[PDB]
Design an enzyme around this catalytic site. Structure first.
Site, PDB file in Angstrom:
ATOM      1  N   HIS A  19       0.859  -1.212   0.000  1.00  0.00           N
ATOM      2  CA  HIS A  19       0.000   0.000   0.000  1.00  0.00           C
ATOM      3  C   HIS A  19       0.871   1.230   0.000  1.00  0.00           C
ATOM      4  O   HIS A  19       2.067   1.171   0.352  1.00  0.00           O
ATOM      5  CB  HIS A  19      -0.917   0.079   1.249  1.00  0.00           C
ATOM      6  CG  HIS A  19      -0.223  -0.140   2.555  1.00  0.00           C
ATOM      7  ND1 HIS A  19      -0.721  -1.009   3.511  1.00  0.00           N
ATOM      8  CD2 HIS A  19       0.892   0.417   3.091  1.00  0.00           C
ATOM      9  CE1 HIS A  19       0.086  -1.006   4.558  1.00  0.00           C
ATOM     10  NE2 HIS A  19       1.048  -0.119   4.355  1.00  0.00           N
ATOM     11  N   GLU A  70      -3.410   3.489   2.262  1.00  0.00           N
ATOM     12  CA  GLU A  70      -3.484   3.638   3.697  1.00  0.00           C
ATOM     13  C   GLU A  70      -3.565   5.124   4.012  1.00  0.00           C
ATOM     14  O   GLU A  70      -2.575   5.822   3.868  1.00  0.00           O
ATOM     15  CB  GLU A  70      -2.286   2.984   4.443  1.00  0.00           C
ATOM     16  CG  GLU A  70      -2.204   3.404   5.917  1.00  0.00           C
ATOM     17  CD  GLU A  70      -1.137   2.654   6.715  1.00  0.00           C
ATOM     18  OE1 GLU A  70      -0.745   1.527   6.319  1.00  0.00           O
ATOM     19  OE2 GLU A  70      -0.740   3.193   7.790  1.00  0.00           O
ATOM     20  N   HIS A  88       1.577  10.898  -8.837  1.00  0.00           N
ATOM     21  CA  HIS A  88       0.163  10.513  -8.846  1.00  0.00           C
ATOM     22  C   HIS A  88       0.046   9.066  -8.446  1.00  0.00           C
ATOM     23  O   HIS A  88       1.043   8.330  -8.397  1.00  0.00           O
ATOM     24  CB  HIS A  88      -0.482  10.676 -10.228  1.00  0.00           C
ATOM     25  CG  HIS A  88       0.261  10.026 -11.367  1.00  0.00           C
ATOM     26  ND1 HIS A  88       1.017  10.747 -12.268  1.00  0.00           N
ATOM     27  CD2 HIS A  88       0.275   8.746 -11.808  1.00  0.00           C
ATOM     28  CE1 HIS A  88       1.494   9.930 -13.189  1.00  0.00           C
ATOM     29  NE2 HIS A  88       1.030   8.711 -12.956  1.00  0.00           N
ATOM     30  N   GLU A 136      -4.135   9.480 -11.977  1.00  0.00           N
ATOM     31  CA  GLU A 136      -4.233   9.147 -13.378  1.00  0.00           C
ATOM     32  C   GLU A 136      -5.255   8.036 -13.550  1.00  0.00           C
ATOM     33  O   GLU A 136      -5.255   7.067 -12.793  1.00  0.00           O
ATOM     34  CB  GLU A 136      -2.867   8.658 -13.868  1.00  0.00           C
ATOM     35  CG  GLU A 136      -2.755   8.555 -15.401  1.00  0.00           C
ATOM     36  CD  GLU A 136      -1.377   8.102 -15.853  1.00  0.00           C
ATOM     37  OE1 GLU A 136      -0.631   7.508 -15.049  1.00  0.00           O
ATOM     38  OE2 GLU A 136      -1.107   8.234 -17.053  1.00  0.00           O
TER      39      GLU A 136
HETATM   40  N1  LIG Z   1       6.533  17.156 -16.277  1.00  0.00           N
HETATM   41  C1  LIG Z   1       5.707  15.930 -16.171  1.00  0.00           C
HETATM   42  C2  LIG Z   1       6.332  14.916 -17.127  1.00  0.00           C
HETATM   43  C3  LIG Z   1       5.589  13.574 -17.149  1.00  0.00           C
HETATM   44  C4  LIG Z   1       4.336  13.621 -17.995  1.00  0.00           C
HETATM   45  O1  LIG Z   1       3.934  14.673 -18.525  1.00  0.00           O
HETATM   46  N2  LIG Z   1       3.726  12.417 -18.098  1.00  0.00           N
HETATM   47  C5  LIG Z   1       2.547  12.163 -18.934  1.00  0.00           C
HETATM   48  C6  LIG Z   1       1.975  10.737 -18.833  1.00  0.00           C
HETATM   49  S1  LIG Z   1       3.265   9.445 -18.940  1.00  0.00           S
HETATM   50  C7  LIG Z   1       1.480  13.196 -18.680  1.00  0.00           C
HETATM   51  O2  LIG Z   1       1.164  13.570 -17.547  1.00  0.00           O
HETATM   52  N3  LIG Z   1       0.976  13.692 -19.795  1.00  0.00           N
HETATM   53  C8  LIG Z   1      -0.095  14.667 -19.795  1.00  0.00           C
HETATM   54  C9  LIG Z   1      -0.950  14.548 -21.044  1.00  0.00           C
HETATM   55  O3  LIG Z   1      -0.844  13.535 -21.789  1.00  0.00           O
HETATM   56  O4  LIG Z   1      -1.746  15.486 -21.262  1.00  0.00           O
HETATM   57  C10 LIG Z   1       5.650  15.407 -14.737  1.00  0.00           C
HETATM   58  O5  LIG Z   1       6.693  15.552 -14.075  1.00  0.00           O
HETATM   59  O6  LIG Z   1       4.595  14.968 -14.183  1.00  0.00           O
HETATM   60 CO   LIG Z   2       1.347   7.332 -14.575  1.00  0.00          CO
END
Ligand SMILES: N[C@@H](CCC(=O)N[C@@H](CS)C(=O)NCC(=O)O)C(=O)O
Ligand SMILES: [Co+2]
Length: 282
Positions: A19, A70, A88, A136
């Site tokens: 967890h 938790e 996240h 997410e």
């Molecule tokens: N600067 C971002 C880079 C990572 C990122 O952007 N990851 C993707 C998913 S792997 C995301 O959140 N994308 C937003 C979208 O697709 O609109 C972070 O640190 O959270």
């Molecule tokens: Co993710």
């Protein structure tokens, strides 16, 4: 010598993500959000007067087979610093459009509408919970484990990958550079990504430090032997960074065996004996 014995131990052990532990300003509000918006089950709730806190455990299956959250409510504490490093949690679901619209109906917050990930094809969305933690939502056909990621940001992705491999026996399941958006991710864990809870580590180009906040506490991982597993951590930390916090051993009076440590970025992990873990699950 010891590196060979560590490899053998990681092979012989059966580790499991248990967890994520983190703190909430309003326990009832969070329970209601997770059950109604996210379709989680309330698994257990424990009020602890003596130490001034209440826990709740939630997830999509019982804690002996599934990953859980938790939640820690500290009496008269109504907010925490998330910090910039915590990414996240993720929930996999076979219809993310259905789920996002459910969240909106229930009065939840969708911060990123459902659709393909930018320059990929997986349909994702994002929700924010009452304390600001991001979730997410990931479209996935049929997993045994809907609570499927904890995502943490790290300062050196190659150092972190080596660390989780050697300290924890995790497999590198995925590594993906996204230069158009100046990030790289890795997925680490103990089974196929689509069947399990992975640790997703994100590196943003040229960013080496993040605040840990005081909201996210730790992730707990089960092992058949906290002493053998802590030896592997000790060896990894000598090479790569991180530090043992609590040496392996039974808790006072309970004989529940745990160890704990931080990784090279300062993220906390607790190792818990796989059998002793079961003692509280009722
Ligand atoms: N600067 C971002 C880079 C990572 C990122 O952007 N990851 C993707 C998913 S792997 C995301 O959140 N994308 C937003 C979208 O697709 O609109 C972070 O640190 O959270
Ligand atoms: Co993710």
């Amino acid at each position: 010598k010891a590196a060979e014995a560590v490899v053998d131990w990681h092979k012989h052990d059966s580790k499991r993500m248990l967890h994520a532990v983190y703190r909430v300003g309003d326990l009832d509000r969070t329970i209601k959000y997770y059950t109604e918006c996210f379709g989680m089950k309330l698994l257990r709730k424990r009020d602890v007067p003596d130490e001034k806190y209440t826990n709740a455990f939630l997830g999509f299956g019982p804690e002996n087979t599934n990953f859980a959250v938790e939640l820690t409510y500290n009496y008269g504490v109504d907010k925490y610093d998330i910090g910039t490093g915590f990414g996240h949690f993720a929930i996999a679901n076979d219809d993310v459009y259905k789920l996002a619209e459910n969240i909106k109906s229930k009065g939840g917050k969708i911060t990123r509408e459902p659709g393909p990930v930018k320059g990929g094809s997986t349909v994702i969305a994002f929700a924010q919970d009452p304390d600001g933690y991001m979730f997410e939502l990931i479209q996935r056909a049929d997993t045994p484990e809907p609570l499927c990621q904890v995502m943490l940001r790290v300062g050196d992705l190659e150092r972190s990958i080596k660390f989780y491999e050697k300290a924890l026996g995790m497999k590198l399941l995925r590594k993906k550079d996204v230069p158009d958006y100046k990030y790289t991710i890795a997925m680490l864990g103990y089974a196929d990504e689509d069947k399990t809870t992975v640790l997703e580590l994100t590196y943003n180009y040229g960013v080496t430090e993040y605040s840990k906040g005081n909201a996210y506490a730790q992730v707990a991982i089960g092992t058949n032997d906290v002493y053998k597993s802590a030896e592997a951590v000790d060896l990894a930390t000598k090479e790569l960074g991180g530090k043992i916090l609590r040496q392996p051993g039974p808790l006072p009076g309970i004989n529940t065996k745990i160890a704990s440590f931080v990784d090279p970025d300062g993220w906390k992990v607790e190792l818990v004996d796989n059998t002793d873990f079961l003692k509280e699950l009722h």
